[PDB]
Ligand binder design. Structure first.
Ligand SMILES: COc1ccc(/C(C)=N/OC(N)=O)cc1OC1CCCC1
Ligand SMILES: [Mg+2]
Ligand SMILES: [Zn+2]
Length: 323
């Protein structure tokens, strides 16, 4: 209440503590943070979105994240949305995006993992799940998250984009699909290679603000921004990062337990009897998170240097915990 307002004073900051907001919002972190973000950016006024309609959609959307899944629940979506909200304000990106693009990125972050079952795409493919049969083994979960999020927009009492232009709805939909499909980790290397090429040919105004010519360049940055937000856990304070690590390992180890039950091959990092939690985060940082953030930093330099410093410190802490 008074605690919630205090925590929300850091809405525009990387140090915002989403666990605290969840505790003071009746376990509706996604709904609460999305509402705070939309008010801060005047998006309700700009896109003539009624508050009742927005809350109804957000609450329904939130209720579609599974509370018994350790990591991929509404708290993660709320964290990715808030992080995206901060990245969109990076000084190097000042005024580069339209209001419609800003709206799509945050919307995309909110819905990006909805109805996640707590098991990976590969698990769904190997167990011949209905989801994998439906989506022909390609970005199974991610096509699913999009389908649910857009499906929920179909009822009049939930259509937050009702007052957008027809062309605006088409553009937003195209951008949102692009962004969520880009959160599929199997596309990470490809996304990173393309980000490195954009850094290579980076152009700016005299005042250090990126110049993004066509829709193509703008959406490539937005895709990558949402992907960094999704892989932002190790760039946050150690206290936050460790809670995030505890949650993903609980989810991964539960997957391993389901694999063992069924006589399947146990995915190595999902095997509770052998996997080092500490070693695994070091590898995650060295081979995936750092290379991505190093490249993001280059694109928006020097705005992300503090994030990179925190990342290195967190990496060394996990390393120091390994005997
Ligand atoms: C806090 O650590 C993590 C945070 C987020 C993830 C992401 C990649 N979740 O899984 C996928 N494939 O979506 C993965 C993380 O770590 C994994 C588990 C051990 C090392 C890599
Ligand atoms: Mg996902
Ligand atoms: Zn995610």
């Amino acid at each position: 209440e008074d605690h919630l307002a205090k925590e929300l004073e850091d809405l525009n900051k990387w140090g915002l503590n989403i666990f605290n907001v969840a505790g003071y919002s009746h376990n509706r972190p996604l709904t609460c943070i999305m509402y705070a973000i939309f008010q801060e950016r005047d998006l309700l006024k700009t896109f003539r979105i009624s508050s009742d309609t927005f809350i109804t959609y957000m609450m329904t959307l939130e209720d579609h994240y599974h509370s018994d899944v350790a990591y991929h629940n509404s708290l993660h979506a709320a964290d990715v949305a808030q992080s995206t909200h901060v990245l969109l304000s990076t000084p190097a990106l000042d005024a580069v995006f339209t209001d419609l693009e800003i709206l799509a990125a945050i919307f995309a972050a909110a819905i990006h993992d909805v109805d996640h079952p707590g098991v990976s795409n590969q698990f769904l493919i190997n167990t011949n799940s209905e989801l994998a049969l439906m989506y022909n083994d390609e970005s199974v979960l991610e096509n699913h998250h999009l389908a649910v999020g857009f499906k929920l927009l179909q009822e009049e009492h939930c259509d937050i984009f009702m007052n957008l232009t027809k062309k605006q709805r088409q553009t937003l939909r195209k951008m949102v699909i692009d962004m969520v499909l880009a959160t599929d980790m199997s596309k990470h290397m490809s996304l990173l290679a393309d980000l490195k090429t954009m850094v290579e040919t980076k152009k700016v105004t005299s005042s250090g603000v990126l110049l993004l010519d066509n829709y193509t360049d703008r959406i490539q940055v937005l895709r990558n921004m949402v992907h960094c937000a999704d892989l932002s856990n190790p760039t946050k304070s150690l206290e936050l990062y460790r809670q995030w690590t505890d949650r993903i390992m609980e989810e991964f180890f539960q997957q391993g337990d389901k694999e063992r039950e069924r006589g399947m091959e146990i995915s190595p990092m999902c095997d509770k009897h052998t996997a080092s939690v500490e070693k695994s985060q070091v590898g995650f940082i060295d081979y995936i998170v750092h290379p991505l953030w190093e490249t993001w930093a280059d694109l928006v330099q020097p705005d992300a240097q503090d994030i990179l410093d925190t990342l290195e410190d967190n990496r060394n802490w996990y390393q120091s915990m390994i005997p």
